[PDB]
Amino acid sequence: VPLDGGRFATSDLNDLYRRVINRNNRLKRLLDLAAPDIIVRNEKRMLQEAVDALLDNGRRGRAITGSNKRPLKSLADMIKGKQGRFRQNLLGKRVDYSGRSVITVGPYLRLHQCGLPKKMALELFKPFIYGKLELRGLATTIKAAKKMVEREEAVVWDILDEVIREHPVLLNRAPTLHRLGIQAFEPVLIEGKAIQLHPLVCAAYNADFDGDQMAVHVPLTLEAQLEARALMMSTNNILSPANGEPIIVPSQDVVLGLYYMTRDCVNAKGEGMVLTGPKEAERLYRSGLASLHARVKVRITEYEKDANGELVAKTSLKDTTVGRAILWMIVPKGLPYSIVNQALGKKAISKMLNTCYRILGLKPTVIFADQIMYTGFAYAARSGASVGIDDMVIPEKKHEIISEAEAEVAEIQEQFQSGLVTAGERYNKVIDIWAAANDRVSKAMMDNLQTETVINRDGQEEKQVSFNSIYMMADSGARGSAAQIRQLAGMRGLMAKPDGSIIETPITANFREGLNVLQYFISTHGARKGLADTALKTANSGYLTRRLVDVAQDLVVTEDDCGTHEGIMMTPVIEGGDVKEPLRDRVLGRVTAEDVLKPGTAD
Amino acid sequence: MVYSYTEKKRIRKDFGKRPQVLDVPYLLSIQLDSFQKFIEQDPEGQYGLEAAFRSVFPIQSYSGNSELQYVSYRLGEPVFDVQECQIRGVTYSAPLRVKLRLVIYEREAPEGTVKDIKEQEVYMGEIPLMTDNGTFVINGTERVIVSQLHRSPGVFFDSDKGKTHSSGKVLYNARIIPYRGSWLDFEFDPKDNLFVRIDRRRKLPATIILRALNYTTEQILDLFFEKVIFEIRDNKLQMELVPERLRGETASFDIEANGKVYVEKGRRITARHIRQLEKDDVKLIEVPVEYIAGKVVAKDYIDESTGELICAANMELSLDLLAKLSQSGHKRIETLFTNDLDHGPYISETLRVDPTNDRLSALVEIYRMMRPGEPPTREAAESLFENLFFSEDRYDLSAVGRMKFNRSLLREEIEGSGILSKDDIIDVMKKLIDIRNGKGEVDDIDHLGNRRIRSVGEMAENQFRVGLVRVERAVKERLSLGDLDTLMPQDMINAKPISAAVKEFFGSSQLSQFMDQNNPLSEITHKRRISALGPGGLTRERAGFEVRDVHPTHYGRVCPIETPEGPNIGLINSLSVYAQTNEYGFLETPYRKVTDGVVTDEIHYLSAIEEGNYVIAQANSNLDEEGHFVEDLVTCRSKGESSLFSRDQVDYMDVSTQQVVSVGASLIPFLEHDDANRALMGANMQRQAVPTLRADKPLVGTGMERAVAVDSGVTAVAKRGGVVQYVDASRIVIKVNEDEMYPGEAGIDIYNLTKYTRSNQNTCINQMPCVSLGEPVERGDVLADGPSTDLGELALGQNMRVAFMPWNGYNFEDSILVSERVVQEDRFTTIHIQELACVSRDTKLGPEEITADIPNVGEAALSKLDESGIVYIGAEVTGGDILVGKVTPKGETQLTPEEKLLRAIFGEKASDVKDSSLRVPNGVSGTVIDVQVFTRDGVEKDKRALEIEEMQLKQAKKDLSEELQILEAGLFSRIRAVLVAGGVEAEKLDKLPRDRWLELGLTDEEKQNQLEQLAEQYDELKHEFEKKLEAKRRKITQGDDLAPGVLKIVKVYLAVKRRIQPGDKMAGRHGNKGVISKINPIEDMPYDENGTPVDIVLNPLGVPSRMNIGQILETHLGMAAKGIGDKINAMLKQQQEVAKLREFIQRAYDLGADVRQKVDLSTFSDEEVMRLAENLRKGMPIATPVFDGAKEAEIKELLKLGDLPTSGQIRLYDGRTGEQFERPVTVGYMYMLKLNHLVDDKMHARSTGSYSLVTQQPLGGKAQFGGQRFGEMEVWALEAYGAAYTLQEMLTVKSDDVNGRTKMYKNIVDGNHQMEPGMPESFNVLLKEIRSLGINIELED
Amino acid sequence: LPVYQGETTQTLQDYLMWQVELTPFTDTDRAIATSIVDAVDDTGYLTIQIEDIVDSIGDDEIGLEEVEAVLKRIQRFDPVGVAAKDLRDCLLIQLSQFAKETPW
Helix, strand or coil: CCCCCCCCCCCCCCHHHHHHHHHHHHHHHHHHHCCCHHHHHHHHHHHHHHHHHHHHCCCCCCCEECCEEEECCCCCCCCCCCCCCCCCCCCCCECCCCCCECEEECCCCCCCCEEEECCCCCCCCHHHHHHHHHHCCCCCCHHHHHHHHHHCCHHHHHHHHHHHHCCCEEECCCCCCCCCCCEEECEEEECCCCEEECCCCCCCCCCCCCCCCECCECCCCHHHHHHHHHCCEHHHCCEECCCCEECCCCCCCHHHHHHHHCCCCCCCCCCCCCECCCCHHHHHHHCCCCCCCCCEEECCEEEEEEECCEEEEEECCCEECHHHHHHHHHCCCCCCCCCCCCCCCHHHHHHHHHHHHHHCCHHHHHHHHHHHHHHHHHHHHHHCCCCCCCCCCCCCHHHHHHHHHHHHHHHHHHHHHHCCCCHHHHHHHHHHHHHHHHHHHHHHHHHHHCCCCCCCCCCCCCCCCCCCHHHHHHHHCCCCCHHHHHHHHCCCECCCCCCCCCCCCCECCCCCCCCCHHHHHHHHHHHHHHHHHHHHHHHHHHHHHHHHHHHCCCCCCCCCCCCCCCCCCCCCEEECCEEEECCCHHHCCCCCCCCCCCCCCCC | CCCCHHHHCCCCEECCCCCCCCCCCCCCCHHHHHHHHHCCCCCCCCCHHHHHHHHHCCCECCCCCEEEEEEEEEECCCCCCHHHHHHHCCCCEEEEEEEEEEEEECCCCCCCEEEEECCCCEEEEEEECCCCCCCCCCCCCCCECCCEEEECCCEECCCCCHHHHCCCCCCCCCEECCCCCCCEEEEECCCCCEEEEECCCCCEEHHHHHHHCCCCHHHHHHHHCCCCCCECHHHCCEECCCCCCCCCCCECCCCCCCCCCCCCCCECCCHHHHHHHHHCCCCCEECCCHHHHHCEECCCCCCCCCCCCCCCCCEECCHHHHHHHHHHCCCECCECCCCCCCCCCCCHHHHHHCCCCCHHHHHHHHHHHHCCCCCCCCCHHHHHHHHHHCCCCCCCCCHHHHHHHHHHCCCCCCCCCCCCCHHHHHHHHHHHHHHHCCCCCCCCCCCCCCEEEECCHHHHHHHHHHHHHHHHHHHHHHHHCCCCCCCCCCCCCCCHHHHHHHHHHHCCCCCCECCCCCCHHHHHHHCCEECCCCCCCCCCCCCCCHHHCCCCCCCCCECCCCCCCCCCCCCCEEECCCCCCCCCCCCCCCCEEEECCEEEEEECCCCHHHHCCCCEECCCCCECCCCCECCCCEEEECCCCCEEECCCCCCEECCCHHHCCCHHHHCCCCCCCCCHHHHHHHHHHHCCCCCCCCCCCCCEECCCHHHHHHHHCCCCCCCCCCEEEEEECCEEEEECCCCCCCCCCCCEEEEECCCCCCCCCCCCCCCCCCCCCCCECCCCCCCCCCCCCECCECCCCECCCEEECCCCCCCCCCEEEECHHHHHHCCCEEEECCEEEEECCCCCCCCCEECCCCCCCCHHHHHCCCCCCCCCCCCEECCCCEEECEEEECCCCCCCHHHHHHHHHCCCCCCCEEECCEECCCCCCEEEEEEEEEEECCCCCCCCHHHHHHHHHHHHHHHHHHHHHHHHHHHHHHHHHHHCCCCCCHHHHHHCCCHHHHHCCCCCCHHHHHHHHHHHHHHHHHHHHHHHHHHHHHHHCCCECCCCCCCEEEEEEEEEEEECCCCEEEECCCCCEEEECCCCCCCCCCECCCCCCCCEEECCCCCCCCCCHHHHHHHHHHHHHHHHHHHHHHHHHCCCCHHHHHHHHHHHHHCCCCCCCCCCCCCCCHHHHHHHHHHCCCCCCEECCCCCCCCHHHHHHHHHHCCCCCCCCECCECCCCCCCCCCCECEECCCEEECCCCCCCCCCCCCCCCEECCCCCECCCCCCCCCCECCHHHHHHHHHHCCHHHHHHHHCCCCCCHHHHHHHHHHHHHCCCCCCCCCCHHHHHHHHHHHHCCCCCCCCC | CCCCCCECCCCCHHHHHHHHHHCCCCHHHHHHHHHHHHCECCCCCECCCHHHHHHHHCCCCCCHHHHHHHHHHCCCCCCCCCCCCCCCHHHHHHHHHCCCCCCC
């Protein structure tokens, strides 16, 4: 590995080896003349020492370098350590068709797609591009192809797209927390400097499409293609293979719109408007209707696959909501339109999804979810959903609750001053007082922003589901929870822990009121802590994890049946007050032993 | 009176509630004062080299009757100019020349000086000057000498209790960290016994030190323990006791109190019992002999007759030995106390545990540990012990260390010796054992009273001292060897080691770091950080978490959110707005004394030890005009747990809301609702800026960016100039005023700006001028303008209007959706410049020559090349054509009949050289802005090179000619005026110079005399000018020093310019990011009621999740400012009345809460209003404090005054089908900026990449069209696929296989669709490494 | 380390071999081409004559005409004027590569 233009510098690659050869020669010169004992013994000792250093410098002695006190890495220090031939060498190597890819967000192009940027392309497709050109005879010579590529014909764009059609690639995220992050999907040529994905596998690749990356994978063999399109395909990566649980579900603002569609303040315009359904698009789409519609009757022809392998339609005249009838047009046949009979929430979105996926089938359910995403992507703008200062309105009871908690604290302090209340008694009681006042103010604010609204009607009082955006967020269930609003709405809370102890003064203000100097400086310990928490704990986590993966490197099923009744029993953990969980999931997909029988005797 | 003339062009709306008292400091006091003192000559040798030389200076020969002295030292003025070094490539370094004094004294004469060489000075190296902008200039690059903040030297009473004990015990250690030497430790073991530790080795006896320290066991006990008299004469078994002295033990029996038994037998000790016992005098009262048996003998007594060693010391008394002693030795003997209730010996135990009893034996074990073998000869151990700690030139801990221990000893003085002292460690063990038994509070690590940030100046002082010792020894050696000489004090003078060490510790290290010039903030802060990393602090980022907490004394010290995203977080602490430095090594913060409640204007710089003392409040408060307090109950900090404090409680007041933050955040926009998560995320996205095409000023920032510029130093401040003369596309000339003019100088300023100059990390950083002409300028005024700022504001960015509303799949969470306008509007374009070069290398096979005569080459490639090969300056680049056209000469050809016929046919080539040329980097293209070249002396080619030489000369020449002309005018006028009143009409003296008729004799007396003098001075100036000219011209072709390798070193530089694109990374100061990924045309941008195609649509589905209440708080403000501009803009578009827009302005400034005073129509003359508006060109600039910013009611107020939705609700028309949709949204114009990690800095592909020579492994990562390396968690997941063929190709197709990649490409062309694995070659490599190790390695069948 | 950058290179003759591998060739054709490649000069002229190559092939079936045909099929593959063989017809092949549209 020459450095300066002049000298090679295989330092210890031979400097150890060369020193060894040199001393060896010196010996071959010396002891053959009946060596003096002192010299010969010292030399042989150095010889053992140096040979060891070449094999294990660290055991005894040291093999430090010129201008560097650091020792020399012996022959197995090329075997031992983090960066050896035993560095990530059970397959951790630098690869061919990929690299350091930036990402876009695929408003269009449903899951049966993957947005591959055209810029990175054809430096991939080039071997295949040349194969196509020669098969097309577009350049009888390889150099002819090389220049015509260096010429960059647009007919090449045509050829690449034709290849880019029937050849998906594989996509992935890095710190591979799963077999869930990496996707194979239908690649598509696109123009810019980022690759777009459907709002689907946003969970799969598991990062979040900000300053980040994804990966490019070239399934070279046809078997690679068939497998990834059948295995690495996200066309099946819904249910959490561990949890069984469908990971794939719209949970972003597509939900927010889905909710906005089926709601009703009290009674919108012509709330008694009723139809059969195909023209609801005409009416609300023309005018006269809002998704805020109440009591709109609708002749609904639900279908049930009640017949064995056969669905029987069934026409009702159910009254429903505007967007309810709409998404009823979205759904396929089987679900009772009572599926559409909902306030239509996030968990519900998942729930209908589950009902379907149990019910219909894979392509069916997938298409349903996809168009679901489509409709939501329409509605959220068809909503839009402003935000603003006033949607934060503090319930007025806050000032009085504060005055009262302060009164309690002052009473505790005066009691401690009288000596009747111990300081620790003062502390525990004051903690209780603050907690109680906090709960009270929390309830006050929540009522201020619960389903609380006065609307015009015949009764002139129809307290309905209100219309603040943030409370709607906590409700339908997209981004945040009640805790988020409260801190931005109620006081900062106790949050009183420099390290573990409870700071007496509680941080008492919301994002509405700002904060205080001491308040913010207080707020910093836990924040830097939690960041450092994710930081350092990733480490021990991965360590244990690899420990496991090694510990499970050979695990497989080789037999179908054991022919044995031995096992352990599956029983509910009626633990604490009750069962933390029903004994339902723990054996949901079970195969009990020959021990299953009815509660009746001999039954 | 905000004259603020350069700021009279544009000011920000303020609402800053609390009023300024002491503004920002120079914001650069740090990397300035220390090095300033480093090259400061002081009356006392007290700092810098003043002491450091005073250390290792005088060398006395090995009794050669010869000693060495010195007079004074000099560091030079420059070699080259700063930019000159930038051009050539040189380290800005200045020599150190020190006068030496070498005296030969005659023998047999007591210091009888005989001969002296007190006349030979040594230039001991070329030392580097810290820059005016505090930078380095060594070997070229831009670097920051990052300091360290680390543990102070002194007494640290370590606890080390709990979990490390692993025994359910709380330990009590004693840690001392000297600045020089090892560490002496008095550890404690689980056995209630102390342990001696030094330099992290095996345990040493606690008693080892004392006995080795000539301390007898008798002395050791007499000091260590207090002994009762215990006078039992005539078998009285009576002892003298004080119930105050020892108490708290139940009286077992034989408890009688001066007659009457006050303590019953078996009666528990009572405070009433102790009080009554103290009430009456107590003599020696008989005690049970059982109290003797446990009693340990204090003194060693011998019998009165025989000096027997009976009753050895540190031994519990034995009744039989008690009788023997009471009969033989005496009646009274010293005994022990060891009140285990309140005390514990812990010393007699280790004294018994002590194996060596003599000072020699004790000193011997010390070496036996230190040297495992090589037993000393009773002098080597003694010498090692004395020179180990009793030496002044080996440990010399610290004088601040002296103050530190002395305070830790509560010693009235604080100035000590760096050397060891016995009373020190004695009291040290005393305190350790005392706190173990409980006497005071142990120290604290993450608390601030104990650390210092270790500067640069003494660091270099130290490196110099380190070298000074290294040569002092050889100085002594030469003074011993061949001392028979009276030569110059240069005999062993080799400064090469000195220069090498100073450079290396500075240069190639981690102590400093190559400074980057991203946006002004990069330097605004990367000169302002404190971390423990390096030689000091936390030797690894691993091995520490506890100090990474939010420290309580640390507030106005480190910045509040400023720490990286990762492993060095929590510890890279950012100096504060109120930052000062302690007297010793630490940092304080100024503080207004709340004197009797009244806030003294006096600010006292306050640090940790002081900080916990007085009573300290929070500023977010009102204060009365008398200075009286608003509320009587004020939450206040006393010792890190703040609480309400009386109006008679708080002792001080701070400065201002800037107390809590540095600037490295304080340029954060309106965090009053920002999440802390958002907070640190935001700032560590804040510095990521690089400049754009046009600078457009932030509309609502914090208010200091002007000041930041005042120190950001990227434009020209106007020091001492009065009238601007010449400003040109690279020149600015300003002629000073006489009142401020110092005579004998020209009195005019010519300042040069570097256009098109790549910066530290290769940006566009162009200082571009301000005024046009005919302008007055005040002292220090900015006129240039470096990048990404405009007319005086550190704005990494500019207002683009945007709206928050979900839409159509482009807004999942984190996409930023701007429409086609800015792509047309260029708003934020890029311009970046990477460097280039070439080399010559006169070789053994022959010098390579730059002639663009590459054999077998195309003319077009050569066509851009000129005769030099230096391509004509100014062309485009695309592809990889050769830029520098060099050829490598090779060995000559023989008769060579084939080559003979070749040179006969073509000739002139003979293949004598090979095309050895330089080209444009792959995929990297552009056009040049300037170039460079280094010709070492010894070659004078100068092909296209003399062009730059000449252009440079032209510039400099025109430059000198200016001053020449000006002073020439002064003189010619002085002459024609001297010719005035001489009857000499100016028609003649104007007609020709003519030496003014060569003193025509108008007075012929003093006019003759004055004329002679004037012609004299005239020629004098002519000569002086020509002389400076000649020196400069010599400097022109002065020539550079290349390495011995390449004969000439030509350096190239070009440009590349970028616009935001599909795939871009912008962000806003509320820390929200975005992947810019769908730019629609102008139509689909949502249309307003006036239809205005709004620019940027974001996802809104997060404003709660990370607390983006601040982003919308702005957005309200931002819409408001666009509106305020709209009103004024229509007003001007009407060309309305001057006072019309005037009242508009005064009103717009006048609404809201009362903060600060700004008023027009009494100060600005009308055109100052005229321009003041003409600049007011899209919105009124507005500034708020982070923590004293505006109130929301003000926003609601502002939104009506210019006819805007204070609600912020307003409809729109859709961009494709255009039905007005619900949700009347809020929108704004919140400024955006661009970070590094460019989209163009990303994408990369390769299908046949470099399989290595070693392992035929990939080239690397895009490095030569290299690629990625797969992921192990992913590969295991792949196993989850069982994607067997995928693995098969990934390791056979997608590994090193030449024999496999070849057949694979062949088939891939052939459409065969198969892979041939064979066998991995890394397998062969490892198999060899096994056979390389002691292993026969093979595979059977 | 022992490897540092550890990247291999073409050295031209192997770059010629890279093209030969993609070029259609027989075992005797591959052997003749490889032998021709073996004695190759830096300038790109043929070190040994066609007759020496025929002797090196050591095949009576291998003749001067077959050697010439193999060399010519490989004479201008990369670059023009490779294996010049007493360069003179090499510049001739180089010009022949240029179109006749060039005057003179």
